[PDB]
PDB file of N, CA and C in Angstrom:
ATOM      1  N   UNK A   1     101.686 108.483  59.333  1.00 13.06           N
ATOM      2  CA  UNK A   1     101.212 109.621  59.508  1.00 13.06           C
ATOM      3  C   UNK A   1     100.196 109.164  60.820  1.00 13.06           C
ATOM      4  N   UNK A   2      99.822 107.836  59.601  1.00 10.25           N
ATOM      5  CA  UNK A   2      99.007 107.240  60.900  1.00 10.25           C
ATOM      6  C   UNK A   2      99.644 106.081  61.952  1.00 10.25           C
ATOM      7  N   UNK A   3     100.961 106.718  61.882  1.00 11.89           N
ATOM      8  CA  UNK A   3     101.822 106.026  63.223  1.00 11.89           C
ATOM      9  C   UNK A   3     100.997 106.896  64.386  1.00 11.89           C
ATOM     10  N   UNK A   4     100.400 108.132  64.208  1.00 12.02           N
ATOM     11  CA  UNK A   4     100.055 108.346  65.585  1.00 12.02           C
ATOM     12  C   UNK A   4      98.681 107.369  65.766  1.00 12.02           C
ATOM     13  N   UNK A   5      98.465 105.966  65.216  1.00 12.11           N
ATOM     14  CA  UNK A   5      97.539 105.661  65.150  1.00 12.11           C
ATOM     15  C   UNK A   5      97.895 104.502  67.275  1.00 12.11           C
ATOM     16  N   UNK A   6      99.400 104.420  67.245  1.00  8.61           N
ATOM     17  CA  UNK A   6      99.829 103.821  68.297  1.00  8.61           C
ATOM     18  C   UNK A   6      99.659 104.628  69.397  1.00  8.61           C
ATOM     19  N   UNK A   7      99.658 106.471  69.429  1.00  9.07           N
ATOM     20  CA  UNK A   7      98.886 106.972  70.261  1.00  9.07           C
ATOM     21  C   UNK A   7      97.442 106.569  70.877  1.00  9.07           C
ATOM     22  N   UNK A   8      96.870 106.154  70.110  1.00  8.06           N
ATOM     23  CA  UNK A   8      95.159 105.502  70.794  1.00  8.06           C
ATOM     24  C   UNK A   8      94.924 104.771  71.815  1.00  8.06           C
ATOM     25  N   UNK A   9      96.448 103.828  71.447  1.00  7.21           N
ATOM     26  CA  UNK A   9      96.654 102.708  72.366  1.00  7.21           C
ATOM     27  C   UNK A   9      97.745 103.253  73.941  1.00  7.21           C
ATOM     28  N   UNK A  10      97.200 104.608  74.042  1.00 11.45           N
ATOM     29  CA  UNK A  10      97.891 105.271  75.479  1.00 11.45           C
ATOM     30  C   UNK A  10      96.195 104.808  76.244  1.00 11.45           C
ATOM     31  N   UNK A  11      95.791 104.973  75.299  1.00 13.76           N
ATOM     32  CA  UNK A  11      94.406 105.075  75.718  1.00 13.76           C
ATOM     33  C   UNK A  11      93.496 103.556  76.592  1.00 13.76           C
ATOM     34  N   UNK A  12      94.815 102.762  75.823  1.00 18.40           N
ATOM     35  CA  UNK A  12      94.155 101.762  76.432  1.00 18.40           C
ATOM     36  C   UNK A  12      94.779 100.976  77.626  1.00 18.40           C
ATOM     37  N   UNK A  13      95.803 101.699  77.488  1.00 18.69           N
ATOM     38  CA  UNK A  13      96.970 102.002  79.356  1.00 18.69           C
ATOM     39  C   UNK A  13      96.531 102.248  80.793  1.00 18.69           C
ATOM     40  N   UNK A  14      95.143 103.331  80.088  1.00 20.27           N
ATOM     41  CA  UNK A  14      94.558 104.190  81.613  1.00 20.27           C
ATOM     42  C   UNK A  14      94.022 103.026  81.763  1.00 20.27           C
ATOM     43  N   UNK A  15      92.868 101.838  80.507  1.00 19.63           N
ATOM     44  CA  UNK A  15      91.872 100.862  81.180  1.00 19.63           C
ATOM     45  C   UNK A  15      92.969 100.048  81.918  1.00 19.63           C
ATOM     46  N   UNK A  16      94.009  99.656  82.015  1.00 21.13           N
ATOM     47  CA  UNK A  16      94.151  99.136  83.351  1.00 21.13           C
ATOM     48  C   UNK A  16      94.242  99.658  84.164  1.00 21.13           C
ATOM     49  N   UNK A  17      94.613 100.651  84.282  1.00 22.12           N
ATOM     50  CA  UNK A  17      94.804 101.602  85.802  1.00 22.12           C
ATOM     51  C   UNK A  17      93.505 101.391  86.729  1.00 22.12           C
ATOM     52  N   UNK A  18      92.340 101.092  85.734  1.00 25.11           N
ATOM     53  CA  UNK A  18      90.790 101.312  85.749  1.00 25.11           C
ATOM     54  C   UNK A  18      90.765 100.193  86.555  1.00 25.11           C
ATOM     55  N   UNK A  19      91.634  99.321  87.450  1.00 22.46           N
ATOM     56  CA  UNK A  19      91.643  97.687  87.949  1.00 22.46           C
ATOM     57  C   UNK A  19      91.967  98.163  89.645  1.00 22.46           C
ATOM     58  N   UNK A  20      92.593 100.129  89.494  1.00 22.02           N
ATOM     59  CA  UNK A  20      93.238 100.057  90.480  1.00 22.02           C
ATOM     60  C   UNK A  20      91.539 100.543  91.149  1.00 22.02           C
ATOM     61  N   UNK A  21      91.002 100.633  90.678  1.00 19.72           N
ATOM     62  CA  UNK A  21      89.544 100.253  90.813  1.00 19.72           C
ATOM     63  C   UNK A  21      89.242  99.640  92.843  1.00 19.72           C
ATOM     64  N   UNK A  22      89.244  98.731  92.044  1.00 18.28           N
ATOM     65  CA  UNK A  22      89.007  98.171  92.830  1.00 18.28           C
ATOM     66  C   UNK A  22      89.134  97.951  94.227  1.00 18.28           C
ATOM     67  N   UNK A  23      91.013  98.239  94.364  1.00 19.74           N
ATOM     68  CA  UNK A  23      91.464  98.299  95.784  1.00 19.74           C
ATOM     69  C   UNK A  23      90.289  99.967  96.413  1.00 19.74           C
ATOM     70  N   UNK A  24      90.369 101.053  95.427  1.00 21.65           N
ATOM     71  CA  UNK A  24      89.625 101.846  96.047  1.00 21.65           C
ATOM     72  C   UNK A  24      87.823 101.493  97.117  1.00 21.65           C
ATOM     73  N   UNK A  25      87.380  99.996  96.420  1.00 18.90           N
ATOM     74  CA  UNK A  25      86.129  99.483  97.375  1.00 18.90           C
ATOM     75  C   UNK A  25      86.262  99.472  98.173  1.00 18.90           C
ATOM     76  N   UNK A  26      87.773  99.259  98.418  1.00 16.81           N
ATOM     77  CA  UNK A  26      87.981  98.867 100.255  1.00 16.81           C
ATOM     78  C   UNK A  26      87.813  99.698 101.402  1.00 16.81           C
ATOM     79  N   UNK A  27      87.576 101.051 100.366  1.00 12.73           N
ATOM     80  CA  UNK A  27      87.862 102.104 101.364  1.00 12.73           C
ATOM     81  C   UNK A  27      85.953 102.750 101.499  1.00 12.73           C
ATOM     82  N   UNK A  28      84.902 101.501 100.153  1.00 14.10           N
ATOM     83  CA  UNK A  28      83.644 102.071 100.932  1.00 14.10           C
ATOM     84  C   UNK A  28      83.456 100.867 102.335  1.00 14.10           C
ATOM     85  N   UNK A  29      84.618 100.091 102.787  1.00 13.57           N
ATOM     86  CA  UNK A  29      84.414  99.135 104.027  1.00 13.57           C
ATOM     87  C   UNK A  29      84.390 100.108 104.744  1.00 13.57           C
ATOM     88  N   UNK A  30      84.924 100.912 104.727  1.00 19.12           N
ATOM     89  CA  UNK A  30      85.702 102.754 106.094  1.00 19.12           C
ATOM     90  C   UNK A  30      84.449 102.772 106.023  1.00 19.12           C
ATOM     91  N   UNK A  31      83.381 103.504 105.462  1.00 17.09           N
ATOM     92  CA  UNK A  31      82.351 104.543 105.670  1.00 17.09           C
ATOM     93  C   UNK A  31      81.802 103.585 106.599  1.00 17.09           C
ATOM     94  N   UNK A  32      81.322 102.514 106.245  1.00 16.86           N
ATOM     95  CA  UNK A  32      80.242 101.031 107.664  1.00 16.86           C
ATOM     96  C   UNK A  32      80.992 101.815 108.535  1.00 16.86           C
ATOM     97  N   UNK A  33      82.479 101.931 108.995  1.00 16.05           N
ATOM     98  CA  UNK A  33      82.770 101.951 110.337  1.00 16.05           C
ATOM     99  C   UNK A  33      81.775 103.512 111.210  1.00 16.05           C
ATOM    100  N   UNK A  34      81.699 103.933 110.213  1.00 12.82           N
ATOM    101  CA  UNK A  34      80.330 105.384 110.501  1.00 12.82           C
ATOM    102  C   UNK A  34      79.297 104.273 111.278  1.00 12.82           C
ATOM    103  N   UNK A  35      78.760 103.565 111.155  1.00 13.53           N
ATOM    104  CA  UNK A  35      77.356 102.810 111.470  1.00 13.53           C
ATOM    105  C   UNK A  35      78.046 102.622 113.135  1.00 13.53           C
ATOM    106  N   UNK A  36      79.124 102.735 113.063  1.00 11.09           N
ATOM    107  CA  UNK A  36      79.401 101.969 115.026  1.00 11.09           C
ATOM    108  C   UNK A  36      79.097 103.610 115.822  1.00 11.09           C
TER     109      UNK A  36
END
């Protein structure tokens, strides 16, 4: 029944996706174009 403990690791994979947020940080730079 502890085998379900491995399913919790799937949540750790979601933390790896958070690295994609760094790519969205470039979208904030596009917002500065509005200053023009």
